[PDB]
Amino acid sequence: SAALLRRGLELLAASEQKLRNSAKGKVPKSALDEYRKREC
Amino acid sequence: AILEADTEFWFSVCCEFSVQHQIQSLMNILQYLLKLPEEEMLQVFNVETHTSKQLRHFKFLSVSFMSQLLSSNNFLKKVVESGGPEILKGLEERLLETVLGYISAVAQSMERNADKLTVKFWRALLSKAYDLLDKVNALLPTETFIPVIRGLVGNPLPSVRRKALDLLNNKLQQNISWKKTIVTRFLKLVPDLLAIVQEQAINRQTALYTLKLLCKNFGAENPDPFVPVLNTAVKLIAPERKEEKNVLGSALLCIAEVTSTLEALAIPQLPSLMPSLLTTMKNTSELVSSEVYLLSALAALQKVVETLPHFISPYLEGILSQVI
Incomplete structure (x- = not known):
């Protein structure tokens, strides 16, 4: 556990x-906001 | 190209239904993959007729489809139309438990290597299991992340708690500023972390690392909740009770960080803190084990003296000896 x-x-x-x-x-970046940014 | 068309057809089939049944089916297939023979039980897949390579490709395709479905446009459209993350109440925490349990189980099976060529497939299976883990967390808002991370800390299994603390550390290290209510939500994890550190030594040391990260990120703006932590740290550094050297050094680093953030609030604890620290270093000076123990002890002295110069007077002679 020295690390x-x-x-x-x-x-x-x-x-x-x-x-x-x-x-x-x-x-990880939030997927729902990546969805809502482009397709919606 | 058959993969793409078949997975799109399966995406349509799954997203015809609502999100609850989809996630429940994901957990059920996780269980079914967990109960496979690996060479009573509801026999849905015919092991007897299929070859072992076919069962291997079956597991691989199952986990890849899991990740692809959680990343699919159709599933996210269904979630957004259904209303948003608030539809997922209770499902998310059990999903995290199931994913972490399955990934720990497949890792343990990978440790039981049979050599030959199964090692490569097992490594790939772990890689896509971690892909599943990373895509599960991406559907989870930071607000709901804290109750579920607390519940995962409350899990009896020791590896699940370690994974939980690792994810919490990852979110804490992202150097992005935070809203006030989110900071208050982070503040509530402190008593539970103090309960954890006070079990495997790695878990306690990781809890100390989380406390240090919290004290770095928010300790300047909201110092008061960090006052009890220092107290516990002193109870760890006291030489009356023996502690692991690895967690002793981490307790020392937490002492240094908290005393840096609590410049004046640490005055009442100084009569109890200071005599113990000196003794520890003497033992650490006697030991020739490693550089890190001595360096952590010197860090403790450096931060204690620099942040609070004027109050080590009754102990002053002593530290001069430890200087020599």
């Missing part, structure tokens, strides 16, 4: 085809 400490240290540092295998990553 999560490193991000926490990075988190303080701010304070001053690909097969997916994890749920941590980018944020």
